[PDB]
Amino acid sequence: LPSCKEDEYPVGSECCPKCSPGYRVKEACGELTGTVCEPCPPGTYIAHLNGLSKCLQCQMCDPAMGLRASRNCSRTENAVCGCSPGHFCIVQDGDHCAACRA
């Protein structure tokens, strides 16, 4: 097929190796240089091999909403929010809590 391998992504007619989770493309590969990947900036993440120039925005856990980061945001994993201690969940959105009351 014309498509690139799993490990790789298209840059016009080329296929370039992908960045590891935690990193984004700064320079596309060519004849003389490989893919140059930089770590996701503070506040963003990517859980997968990718060929993107940007990372995804991490989930904020707003303490004004009674929330605390139950898992911090890291280069390879979104933040997970839970209730601050002494607060209880007042709105559940699927498998996560969106707001807590004292």
Taking the domains of the chain in order of start, what are their residue ranges? 1-57, 58-102
Would you say the CATH fold of 58-102 matches that of 1-57?
yes
Residues 6 or more apart in contact with residue 96 via CB below 8 angstroms: 80, 81
Resolution in A: 1.9
* Superfamily the domain 1-57 falls into: Tumor Necrosis Factor Receptor, subunit A, domain 2 (2.10.50.10)
CA distance 26 to 35: 8
CA distance 88 to 99: 8
The length of the chain, given as a count of residues: 102
CA distance 2 to 59: 36
Q: Does domain 58-102 have CATH number 2.40.50.100?
A: no
The technique by which this structure was obtained is: X-ray
Beta strands in the chain (DSSP E): 8-11, 14-17, 23-27, 36-39, 44-45, 56-57, 67-71, 80-83, 88-93, 96-101
Task: Identify any residues that bridge with 69 across adjacent strands, giving them in sequence order.
Answer: 81
CB 37 within 8 A of CB 28: no
